[PDB]
């Protein structure tokens with residue numbers, strides 16, 4: 256029924272990479288900004304290293320390992336890549352560094368400077384990665400603006416696959432109704448989450464259903480209520496979100512369709528999003544935690560035979 260998964264999982268020596276700074280902390284683990292030099296080859300790769308702070312807990316490791324298994328098995332420009340695993344006292348995940356951080360943080364921080372062309376483009380990129388997930392048959396089960404990371408302001412990537420699962424087999428606000436009521440997840444259910452994600456970007460990081468109980472949420476959706484149209488949004492952009500939130504999953508648009516629609520819009524962005532001073536805005540040595548190296552290469556340019 257299924258093809259063999261012939262992805263390579265790479266084991267790395269601790270000496271190979273160094274941790275420079277702490278990006279985030281808490282719960283099971285903390286993730287570090289880092290530099291990785293691979294073996295014999297003389298290149299330096301910027302990495303995000305995530306490791307379990309609380310030593311080893313036998314229950315805990317399954318989640319970290321599963322994340323690695325899924326990450327290794329994916330190759331796409333708009334999906335985040337796992338370089339290696341380090342089997343120390345604590346399992347360590349070495350991943351490509353997304354220098355500009357969380358997409359959700361980014362829109363909130365830069366809302367004054369984010370143009371329509373960037374927004375439509377981000378929408379296209381997320382759909383492309385998500386469609387790739389669909390080709391895989393993997394389901395994100397947790398797609399949100401928070402789970403998209405930006406490598407350059409013009410290039411974002413889907414992330415947080417730890418909960419990811421194969422088709423067949425909490426972020427209640429992002430969840431589809433079929434997921435809330437019946438714990439059912441499908442690529443189409445994923446599409447609904449994509450719509451909430453699009454809404455977050457359009458609203459520049461606003462919180463959906465703010466001040467609403469999750470307990471409340473199923474009824475509201477059952478009621479047929481949905482998220483409001485964003486001020487920047489034209490009816491054409493808003494309608495796409497609405498289709499994503501339709502109760503009948505098959506009725507909802509496919510990611511492959513979503514890529515098509517957003518691109519057409521991206522072709523003439525001002526028509527579909529109206530934002531004050533759209534024309535004016537601009538969005539971004541240059542390496543941190545090291546002075547020495549100009550041998551740096553992005554993970555993306557670093558390929559493995």
Ligand SMILES: */C=C/C(=O)Nc1cccc(-n2c(=O)cc(C)c3cnc(Nc4ccc(N5CCN(C)CC5)cc4OC)nc32)c1
Nearest residue numbers: 278279286303350351352353354355356357358359401402
């Ligand atoms: C979206 C919320 C969020 O903070 N997510 C987050 C926090 C910390 C680390 C990561 N994170 C990963 O979990 C996994 C990978 C692969 C990853 C890759 N690259 C980054 N880059 C990155 C994230 C966050 C930050 N900051 C620093 C400044 N601080 C105020 C905000 C968060 C910086 C950064 O690279 C500079 N993060 C990753 C995700």
